[PDB]
Amino acid sequence: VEQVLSLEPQHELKFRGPFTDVVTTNLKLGNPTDRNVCFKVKTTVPRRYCVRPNSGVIDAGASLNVSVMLQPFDYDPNEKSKHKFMVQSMFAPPDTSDMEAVWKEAKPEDLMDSKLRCVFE
C-alpha cells in the first residue's frame, strides 16, 4: 500500500555529533491530498529518542516538521536496534477526531508504512 505522505528525508535520518549532547534532526511530513491524514512515528528504541510531535493529524495540503531528538544514551541495553524508525499513516475518517479508536479499527490495507534508518556521523 503506497505512502500518500511525502517524507523528507524518506530513507535515512542523519545525526551529526557530538554524541555527548542531544542531536536534533528534522523529518518533514507533507500531505499532498485533499484529506486529513493521521500519522504515528515509531522506533525500535523509543527510550533513546524524543520525537515531537510523535503522532497527530496533518491537514490536507499541509506539512509538519517532526523533531527527532537523539538522546546521548539510555538505560535500556536490551533494545535491539538503535537505528530503525517508521512513519505509519492512514486517512482520517470524515466525522472523527478520536484518533485512538480509528487506529485500532484500521484494516491492514488502510495503513501506510514508511521505514527509515538512522545513521550516526
Partner: peptide, 7 residues
Amino acid sequence: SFFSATE
C-alpha cells in the same frame, strides 16, 4: 519490534 515513539 517497532514501538510508539515518545516525546
